[PDB]
Structure 1
Amino acid sequence: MKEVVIASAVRTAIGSYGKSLKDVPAVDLGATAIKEAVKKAGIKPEDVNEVILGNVLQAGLGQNPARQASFKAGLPVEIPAMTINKVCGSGLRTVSLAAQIIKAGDADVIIAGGMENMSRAPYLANNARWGYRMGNAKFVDEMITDGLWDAFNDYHMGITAENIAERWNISREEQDEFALASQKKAEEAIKSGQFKDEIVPVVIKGRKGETVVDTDEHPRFGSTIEGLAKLKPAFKKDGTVTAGNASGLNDCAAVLVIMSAEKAKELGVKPLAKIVSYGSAGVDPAIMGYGPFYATKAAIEKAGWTVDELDLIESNEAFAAQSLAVAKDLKFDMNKVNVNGGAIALGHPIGASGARILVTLVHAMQKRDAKKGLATLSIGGGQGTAILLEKC
C-alpha cells in the first residue's frame, strides 16, 4: 500500500494549569499549530484533504472543535474536519487514522494531532434542564469527569497508577528518582535549545500590546530528590503517587502534516520520517497505565523490529509508576527514553499529549540523527496507542 510520511511536526509550548495559556482556547492553540505545520511542510492549504484532531474536554467549546481550529487557521472551508476522543490517546490516534485513510486510498494529505486547554474546562450542572427537584447535587468538574476519572471503577487515573505501583512493586523512591531524571533532562533540553525547531509561538493580545508564549513553563528547574521526598501522596492515604511524580494539568496543541510519500515527492516536500507501523490495544481499566506495553509489542511485531533496534523512545509520563512498569516489561534502555524530558516535567495536555510526544520524537530523531523511533502512551479506560517511525 502507500507509504505514509510525516511532512512537518509543530507544537505550542505546554502551559501550566491556570497559567500561561489560560486565556487561549484550545481551538486557537490548534489554529496556531495548524498554520505553522502547513508552512513548515511547504505545501498549500488547498493541498490538504482532511483535518483530524484530538480533543477530550469538548464541553462548551462549540460545534466540532477540529473544524473550528481548521477555519481559524485559514484553511479552505471545502476541507472536512472531525474531532476524535480517545482520552490521552487522541492526539496519537489521529495520526494512525491519517495513515489508514491514506493507505485506504482516500486521501494524500491530512492534518492530524490534537489540542487541549485543561485550564479552561467548565463546571457542569447535569440536571439543570429538567430540574433537581430537591436536595443538594454535584457541581461537576468537567476536566476531572471527562478527562481524569475512570468511568467503570469510579476513581481517578491516579488510583490506576497506585494499582500498577502496588502490583509491580514500584516504590515511591523509584518513582521519585525517575521524576527527578525527567526534570533534569527537560531543564537541559530547554536550556540547550532542543525544542526551538518544534515550538510555534503563541501571541496573546492583551490590554498593553501583546505577549509571546514560546517556552514550556511546567518544568521545576533545580528539582531535588529531598524536595520530591517531602511531598504527600496525592491520591490516597499512605500512597506512592504525588504531585512530583505525576504530570500536571496542562494546555497545548500539537499538529502534524501527514502525507503519502508519493504526494510528498510530487509537491517537493522533504519528509522527516516514515510511519512504519502503529497499533492500539485494550487492557483492564484498573491498570490502564500498562496499555502501551501491548500497543508497543503489536506495533514492533508489525514492523518486524525488536525493542533493542530502537534509537529513541517517547513513552509518556502521566505517572512515574506506569512509565516505569511499561519500561521494565519492555526492557527499554532508559538512556534512549524521553531524552529531552518527559511529561512529569513538561506537562500532560491530555487530548494533545499523544501528538506532542510524536512531535518531540521526530524532531529529536532529526537533530540526533537517530534512525528508528517509538512513540507510545497510556489511555484512561484501559487502552494504549503506539507508533513506529523511521527517519528519512
Structure 2
Amino acid sequence: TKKTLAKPNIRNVVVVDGVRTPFLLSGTSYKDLMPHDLARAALTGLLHRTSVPKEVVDYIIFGTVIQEVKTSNVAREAALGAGFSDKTPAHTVTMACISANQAMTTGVGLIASGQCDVIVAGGVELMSDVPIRHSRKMRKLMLDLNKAKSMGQRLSLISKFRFNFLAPELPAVSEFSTSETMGHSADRLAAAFAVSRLEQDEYALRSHSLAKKAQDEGLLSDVVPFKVPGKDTVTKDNGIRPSSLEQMAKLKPAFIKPYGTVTAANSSFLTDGASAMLIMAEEKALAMGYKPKAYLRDFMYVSQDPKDQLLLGPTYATPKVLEKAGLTMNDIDAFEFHEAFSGQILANFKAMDSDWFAENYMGRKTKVGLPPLEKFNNWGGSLSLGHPFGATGCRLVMAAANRLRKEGGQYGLVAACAAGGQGHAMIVEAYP
C-alpha cells in the first residue's frame, strides 16, 4: 500500500514522551512570569511525567525568539531550576517560529552523530514586553566610568545640549528587519493565491471547533497542568473560542484596511507557553525500559525570499523532506502544520496544488500535492491553541505522533512556516 521503513546503518532515534504548558493568551495569566519560568515548568512537567533520571540526561536544548536579557541562555537557567544535573549542559537556539524545531533537530543531530544518547529538546516564549532606550541609555552609561575624584560632571553639559531637537529615543520590535508585518504578509500572500475572506473565516472556525472538541475529548495529552504562583492554577488553553461563520465575517480586517481579507479571528494570537520533550536513541529508550511513542524520521529546513514569499515554508519544505525520505502525499496519513494565519495555510495549499507555481518557482516537474484537508490538523492547530514562538515547534511533532497512536496510522508529516522567510518539515514514523 505504501513504501514503509527507516534507514539501516544510521542509528534510530525516538521520542519517549513529550509535554507542554497550557498555551495561554499573552497577558492573561502568565503575565507576571519570566520566560525561563515557563521553561522551568515545562521541563519539570517532563521530568515528572517521564520519570527520567536526572543523571542520564546528556544534553538539553531549548528554543525561543524574544530574549530575557537576564537569562541569555534560557535553556541553561531553566534547566538548573527544574532539577536536571549540573553536568547536563545546555544551549539556547533561536530560529523564529520554528525555534522549537531547531531544538529537536540540533539535538537529534548530536544523537545520530553519536555524541550522546539522551537529549531533552523543547522551547519557551512569553509574550511580555522588551522595549528599550537608545540615547537616554547612551547618555545613560557614559555616566558610569569614573573620573579623577568626581570631575565627570562636564561629561554632562555636552549631555544637556543633546536632547534638544527631539527629547530622547525608545524603540522595540514588531515588523521585520526587512520591513513588513508578519500578518500583513498573510493578507497579501492570501490575495496572491486568491484566498477569499469567507474561505479564511471558515478554516479559522474549523481549528477553533476541532480544538475545543479534541480538548473536551481530552486528546490534548501533551499539556501538563501548571501552578502559577499568582493565579489558582491552569490546565486548559485560552485560544479555544469558536464563533459562528456569520460572526467572523461581521468582523473588520486587521492588517490591510479596509479591503483586507485577514482579520483578528482568522489569525493566531500573542501566546505565552513552553514545551519540553524527551528524545533519545532507540537502543537506550528500550534499554531504559521505555515504550517509545514514535520515531524521529527525516526532516528538512528551507528558506524563501522574505519580501514576497516568507510564509511559504511548507510548500518548499514538504517535498524536499518527503522525497529525501522517499514517500509521497499518499504514504502520509497525518498532517500537523503550523497555523500562523487562516490565509497562510489555505494559500500554502493553493501553492502546493499548482503545477504552475511548482514549475515556475519551486523549479520542479509537477505540483507538490494538496494534503487531504481531512487528515490535516485534526486536533486543532496554532490558530486555536496558540503560537508561542519557538515553543510551538514541539507541540506539533508531539501532537503528530500522538494522533498516529490514538487515531491510527504510521507516517505523519509536520511542517511549519516561519518568520525570517524560512520553513521546516519533518517525517514522524509511529512506533509499534
> Which of the numbers 371, 374, 382 marks the counterpart of 1:335?
374
Give the secondary structure class of the aligned counterpart of 1:213. Answer: coil
2:133 pairs with 1:125: yes
Partner of 2:332: 310
Q: Deviations over 1:27-86 (max 9, x none)?
A: 122112212223333421211111110011114342311111101111111111111110
Letter in 2 for 1:155: E
Structure 2 residues not aligned, in runs of 5+ = 1-9, 140-158, 353-368
Consecutive aligned runs of 4 or more in structure 1 exceeding 6 Å deviation: none
Query: Which residue is 2:358 aligned to?
Result: none
Higher helix share: 1
Q: CA deviation at 1:230?
A: 1.6
Amino acid at match of 2:54: P
Aligned residue for 1:45? 54
TM-score computed with the length of structure 1 as normaliser: 0.93
Contact conserved, 1:314 with 1:374, CA < 8 A, in 2? yes
Structure 1 residue 93: Cα displacement: 1.5
Distance 2:224 2:420 in 1: 32
Aligned-residue Cα RMSD (Å) equals 1.6
The yes-or-no answer on 1:211 pairing with 2:232 is yes
User: Equivalents in 2 of 1:20, 1:359: separation in Å?
Assistant: 24
- Mapped partners of 2:378, 2:167: distance in 1: 49
* Aligned residue identity for 2:121: A
Matching residue's letter, 2:93: I
Q: Which amino acid aligns with 1:380?
A: A
Contact 2:253 2:263 survives alignment (8 Å)? yes
User: Is 2:176 the counterpart of 1:171?
Assistant: no
**Per-residue CA shift, 1:176-235, capped at 9, x if unaligned?**
11101111101111111111x2211110123xxx611010111114x1111111221111
In structure 2, how many angstroms separate the alpha carbons of the residues matched to 1:327 and 1:371? 23
CA contact (8 A) 2:204 2:265 kept: yes
Q: What is the Cα deviation at residue 170 of structure 1?
A: 0.9
For the pair 1:184 / 2:209, whether they are aligned, the reply is yes
The count of corresponding residues between Structure 1 and Structure 2 is 380
Unaligned runs of 5+ in 1: none
In structure 1, how many angstroms separate the alpha carbons of the residues matched to 2:18 and 2:195?
Answer: 34
Q: Distance in 2 between matches of 1:101 and 1:281?
A: 20
* 2:253 paired residue number: 233
Question: Per residue, is there more strand in 1 or in 2?
Answer: 1
Secondary structure at the residue paired with 2:190? helix
Do structure 1's residue 290 and structure 2's residue 312 form an aligned pair?
Answer: yes
Which residue number in structure 1 is paired with residue 222 of structure 2?
Answer: 198
Bigger radius of gyration: 2
Label 1:230 to 1:365 Cα distance change in 2 as closer, same or farther (>3 A). Answer: same
Q: Which of 100, 111, 114 matches 1:105? A: 114
Measure the CA separation in 1 of the matches of 2:70 and 2:386. 22
Equivalent of 2:79, from 30, 47, 70? 70
Q: How far off its partner does 1:375 sit?
A: 1.3
2:298 pairs with one of 274, 277, 280: 277
User: CA separation of 1:2/1:42 partners in 2, compared to 1, >3 Å: closer, same or farther?
Assistant: farther
Aligned residue for 1:362?
401
Q: Take 1:126 and 1:279, find their aligned partners in 2: how far apart are those partners?
A: 39
Q: Which residue of 2 aligns with 1:388?
A: 427
